[PDB]
A paper describes a structure:
AdoMetDC is a pyruvoyl-dependent enzyme that catalyzes formation of decarboxylated AdoMet, a substrate required for biosynthesis of the polyamine spermidine from putrescine. The AdoMetDC pyruvoyl group plays a key role in the catalytic mechanism and derives from an autocatalytic processing reaction that cleaves the peptide backbone into β- and α-chains. Trypanosomatid AdoMetDC undergoes this cleavage, while the corresponding pseudoenzyme, which we call ‘prozyme’, lacks key residues and is not processed to the active form.
Two TbAdoMetDC/prozyme heterodimers are observed per asymmetric unit. In prozyme, the electron density is consistent with a bound putrescine (Put’); however, in TbAdoMetDC the corresponding electron density is larger and the crystallization buffer bis-tris propane (B3P) was modeled into the site. The TbAdoMetDC/prozyme dimer interface contains an extensive buried surface area (3,200 Å2). Firstly, in the TbAdoMetDC/prozyme heterodimer, the autoinhibitory residues (S27-G30) have been displaced from the active site, which relieves the autoinhibition and positions F28 to form the catalytically competent ligand-binding site. This movement is facilitated by cis-to-trans isomerization of P31.
Author numbering:
A (entry chain F): 3 to 24, 33 to 207, 219 to 238, 243 to 286, 291 to 324
B (entry chain A): 5 to 23, 27 to 85
C (entry chain B): 86 to 357
Write the structure that this text describes.
């Protein structure tokens, strides 16, 4: 291959970089917003949330209203909204990055300040597969995310050529000692690849605390919870999930917030550790990750 | 190009001002096993002729040499 | 750059646009002649400040990955830290058939925005190998402290600017490379010294350069002195308490291969 020097301008924006200088092999995307102040459960309507997701090609199909929780079920995505956060998990065919800016604008119209946000995707393949569109999508996701959060940053936890998580994190949390913004969140994610023999479910026993389960296509199950009770016995709930689903590979992510509620379990039943790691963010919180494979 | 290297480039552009040499380095390390028949001196059995040919493969050259009972040290320049 | 040949390994460090990977076939050959067997290969680099100027497979992490995969198909790549900021790219390959004892140590530092009063001494209108002229530079800048009299050393002052030094003591080595240009100021440091705590070693380097920001990566083997300390809750010298003038911006911990860990931390000067 020949190569010469092309004296070209620098892109003035991330968008120019993607278009001028630049089949999805993921399995799920996740988009989360947190607020500087708790938001009234009913100020952001279901109509307004559904219109945001129309920008990502999703139509509302079902929605329930519980104590401190609003659940919106779409064709390929599940949206949860509490006083503390908005979280939407979707399949990979959903261009979930196209809902970032509209979602932020919706918050803006309601005087809601977003002080923390994340975009996450779990990949089975590598972004360096030139026969797949995985890299062009990630580039677009980065365009909207970095455009919306110039102070945010992307990270890649785990082997780039194996199971791993690519996530973008924006931290604008006010941590001045005079601030009442506390950080004692619980976030536990269990991804189970190739489960044995589709639905989107939410269960909740407390107010604002929930468990969500997604199952869809190769089959895979995706479990999440923010319940404080879950952070006292993770090793128990994962074992219950493995028996129920019996996957070949597992990916765990555990949040250790600034006010710690936490290293990944060193051993899982009938599973060998493929990779272990942790991302310690400057804000004091940590995201622990481990991948496993059946022995 | 790939999305990850695209992100890396945007981070380098934002910190770039035309007013440039690459400081960050590349590091290659190779450790070998020792079989019964391995030379008792290991890789130190080679003379400087062997390592000079290695540096030529990357279009560089040795400038000064210091040896030791444990290590051979070479300074290089483009 | 630097080349370190030991009884059992090679360590090749290069800067600029040197296509480092072209020497792999000759290194594999150097191991075959002496009747050795490759069992561990790592390729690593801090994110390039100007990736668009790199050549060969180094113009993209995908191409570095493609190239290394052609020779070591089982190897695995990693990326530690923010991808659009200070991070490290790592490709690791190993064929360890005989469970061995790993007690090595590796400490690397990448420093940007160097002290301006120090850059004055890294300039010179003439080339100077290890002689009385570079001795003045070491005392004037503080390298005499980092590389004391117990070390064998050879260093080079470049023209118009630039400085490199190697140091060896027993089986330990120590190297520094400096790019004094203000608009792209950078300095590197690496050593394999065994130490329960790297705080004094790091600080000794920070006092020389006092950079606006720096990253430190630490490879911890399971059977090393630092490894025993780390794996028992002990402090190893990279914790934030040891750098009060700096703020930790992001830190990563990874067990890239069973029993072997790597720690990396980015520090930024608070600048009151």
């Amino acid at each position: 291959v020949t190569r010469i020097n092309q004296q070209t301008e620098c892109p003035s924006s991330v968008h120019d970089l993607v278009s001028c200088w630049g089949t999805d092999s993921g399995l799920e995307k996740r988009f989360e917003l947190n607020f500087a102040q708790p938001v009234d459960i009913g100020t952001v309507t279901v109509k307004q949330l559904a219109s945001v997701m129309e920008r990502a090609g999703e139509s509302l199909r079902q929605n329930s209203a519980e104590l401190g929780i609003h659940t919106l079920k779409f064709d390929r995505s599940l949206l949860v909204f509490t006083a503390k956060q908005i979280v939407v998990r979707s399949s990979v065919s959903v261009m979930l990055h196209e809902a970032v800016h509209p979602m932020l604008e919706l918050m803006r119209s309601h005087n809601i300040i977003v002080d923390w946000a994340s975009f996450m995707r779990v990949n089975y393949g590598s972004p360096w597969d030139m026969t797949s569109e995985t890299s062009d999508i990630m580039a677009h996701e980065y365009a909207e995310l970095k455009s919306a959060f110039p102070t945010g940053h992307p990270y890649l936890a785990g082997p780039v050529d194996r199971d791993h998580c690519f996530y973008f994190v924006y931290d604008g949390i006010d941590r001045d000692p005079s601030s009442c913004r506390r950080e004692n969140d619980v976030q536990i994610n269990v991804y189970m690849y190739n489960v044995q023999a589709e639905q989107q479910l939410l269960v909740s026993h407390c107010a604002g605390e929930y468990e969500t389960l997604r199952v869809s296509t190769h089959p895979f199950a995706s479990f999440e919870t923010n319940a404080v009770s879950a952070a006292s016995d993770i090793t128990k709930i994962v074992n219950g999930l493995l028996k129920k689903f019996y996957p070949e590979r597992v990916l765990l992510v555990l949040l250790q917030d600034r006010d710690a509620q936490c290293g990944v379990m060193d051993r899982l039943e009938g599973f060998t550790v493929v990779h272990r790691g942790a991302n310690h963010f400057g804000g004091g919180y940590v995201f622990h990750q481990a991948t496993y494979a059946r022995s | 190009k790939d999305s990850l290297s695209l992100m890396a480039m945007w981070g380098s552009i934002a910190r770039f001002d035309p007013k440039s040499f690459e400081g960050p380095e590349k590091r290659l390390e190779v450790i070998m096993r020792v079989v019964d028949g391995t030379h008792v001196s290991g890789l130190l059995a080679h003379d400087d002729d062997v390592w000079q040919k290695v540096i030529d493969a990357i279009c560089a050259h040795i400038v000064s040499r210091e040896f030791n009972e444990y290590i051979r040290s070479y300074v290089l320049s483009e | 750059x630097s080349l370190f040949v030991m009884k059992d390994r090679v360590i090749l460090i290069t800067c600029g646009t040197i296509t480092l990977l072209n020497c792999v076939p000759l290194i594999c050959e150097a191991v075959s002649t002496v009747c050795g067997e490759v069992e561990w290969v790592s390729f690593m680099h801090k994110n390039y400040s100007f990736p668009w100027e790199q050549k060969g497979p180094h113009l993209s992490m995908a191409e570095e990955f493609k190239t290394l995969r052609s020779h070591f198909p089982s190897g695995q790549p990693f990326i530690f830290g923010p991808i659009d900021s200070d991070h490290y790219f790592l490709y690791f390959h190993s064929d360890v058939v005989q469970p061995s004892c790993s007690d090595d140590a590796q400490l690397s530092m990448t420093m940007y925005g160097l002290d301006r009063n120090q850059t004055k001494h890294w300039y010179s209108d003439k080339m100077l190998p290890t002689g009385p002229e570079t001795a003045v530079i070491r005392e004037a800048t503080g390298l005499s402290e980092v590389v004391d009299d117990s070390w064998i050393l050879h260093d080079l002052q470049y023209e118009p600017c630039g400085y490199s030094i190697n140091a060896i003591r027993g089986s330990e080595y120590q190297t520094i490379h400096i790019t004094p240009e203000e608009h792209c100021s950078f300095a590197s440091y690496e050593t394999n010294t065994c130490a329960l705590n790297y705080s004094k070693c790091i600080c000794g380097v920070l006092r020389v350069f006092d950079p606006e920001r720096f990253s430190v990566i630490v490879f911890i083997d399971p059977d090393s002195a630092v490894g025993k300390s780390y794996h028992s809750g002990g402090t190893i010298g990279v914790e934030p308490e040891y750098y009060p003038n700096y703020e930790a911006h992001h830190r990563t911990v990874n067990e890239y291969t069973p029993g072997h860990w790597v720690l990396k931390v980015n520090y930024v000067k608070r600048a009151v």
